[PDB]
Amino acid sequence: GSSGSSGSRPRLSQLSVTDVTTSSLRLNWEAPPGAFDSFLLRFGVPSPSTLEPHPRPLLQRELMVPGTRHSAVLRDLRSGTLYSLTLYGLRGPHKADSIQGTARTLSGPSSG
């Protein structure tokens, strides 16, 4: 009772967040050689579908890091807030893989 699937392909590793700063943090993912050309990290504010969206426009951004480099540092983040990160293993023209890494920033001396 099985179809059968065997194919070697480069995949991303457990994306964890270290040095979680009050309004910043750091990422670290393991990937094999010649896996992807670059890495596109997209960090957006996770909003609940149960509640209504805020009338305030939130600009989105991303980081650009080569395969040889597996790091990502986000700045200008909210305090004590959970951000939804998602890295993409650009294998060239289009993204090949995509991992999800969650992290909660620290709550320090900040203002509104």
UniProtKB/Swiss-Prot annotation:
Residues 11-106 form the Fibronectin type-III domain. Highly expressed in fetal adrenal, in fetal testis, fetal smooth, striated and cardiac muscle. Isoform XB-short is only expressed in the adrenal gland. It comes from the Eukaryota. It is found in: Secreted, Extracellular space, Extracellular matrix. Transmembrane segments: none annotated. It is linked to Ehlers-Danlos syndrome, classic-like, 1: A form of Ehlers-Danlos syndrome, a group of connective tissue disorders characterized by skin hyperextensibility, articular hypermobility, and tissue fragility. EDSCLL1 patients lack atrophic scars, a major diagnostic criteria for classic Ehlers-Danlos syndrome. Delayed wound healing is only present in a subset of patients. EDSCLL1 inheritance is autosomal recessive. Homotrimer. Interacts with type I, III and V collagens and tropoelastin via its 29th fibronectin type-III domain. Appears to mediate interactions between cells and the extracellular matrix. Substrate-adhesion molecule that appears to inhibit cell migration. Accelerates collagen fibril formation. May play a role in supporting the growth of epithelial tumors. Belongs to the tenascin family. This is Tenascin-X. The chain holds residues 3654 to 3752 of 4244 of the full protein.
